[PDB]
Amino acid sequence: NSNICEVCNKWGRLFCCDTCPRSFHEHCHIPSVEANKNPWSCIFCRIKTIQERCPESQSGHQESEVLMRQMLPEEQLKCEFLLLKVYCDSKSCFFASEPYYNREGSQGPQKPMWLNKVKTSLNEQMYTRVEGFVQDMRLIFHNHKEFYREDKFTRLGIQVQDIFEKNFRNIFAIQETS
């Protein structure tokens, strides 16, 4: 096994995957690492099994069809993984916790959103369809773009959104386009 957490790249109290070399802090893994379960398999491994069980799940899909899917267990899992892939970039620190807004010349967003709120929402099964989760994720970056305006800090939102969007297309096997 690895000696650092796969998500935040730090040592500490790590739980080790039994089917791959990855390790995790308790609250870095999504869902939070399960109390018992020996052996234990991480979210990377559980996502690989889904693909291996239904190879055709990797044929191309339309985004509009993906978004309307109900949050059954396998879609729940894929959204948790996509969220985890965003937390794996260090720039996610800017979007993790509840923001506040007091900048000369700007007004705060009507609907604030942050990664830990989306985490809790997933955890509490508040999304009924994929669309619910993707809308909140995209709103995080859209709020940041609007508030920071021409400050070069807006770029952090573009960068972390690109990580989200690349992973969304991968995880949900979105049809490749020019």
Return all residues near 120 (Cβ < 8 A) that are at least 6 apart: none
At its nearest, how many Å lie between Zn ion and the CB of residue 138? Answer: 25
Place of tokens 């899992």: 77
Query: Is 5 one of the binding residues for Zn ion (CB under 5 A)?
Result: yes
- Please state, in angstroms and rounded to a whole number, the distance separating the CA atoms of residues 113 and 27: 20
Binding mask 13-52 for Zn ion (x = CB under 5 A): ----x-xx-x--x--x-------------x-xx-------
At its nearest, how many Å lie between Zn ion and the CB of residue 13? Answer: 9
**For Zn ion, which is the closer residue by CB, 28 or 82?**
28
Burial category of 16 from C-beta neighbours within 10 Å (exposed 0-12, middle 13-18, buried 19 and up): middle
CB 77 within 8 A of CB 46: yes
Burial category of 75 from C-beta neighbours within 10 Å (exposed 0-12, middle 13-18, buried 19 and up): middle
At its nearest, how many Å lie between Zn ion and the CB of residue 9? Answer: 7
Binding mask 107-146 for Zn ion (x = CB under 5 A): ----------------------------------------
Token digits of residue 70: 């109900």
Residues within the interface to Zn ion (CB under 5 A): 5, 7-8, 17, 19-20, 22, 25, 28, 42, 44-45, 54
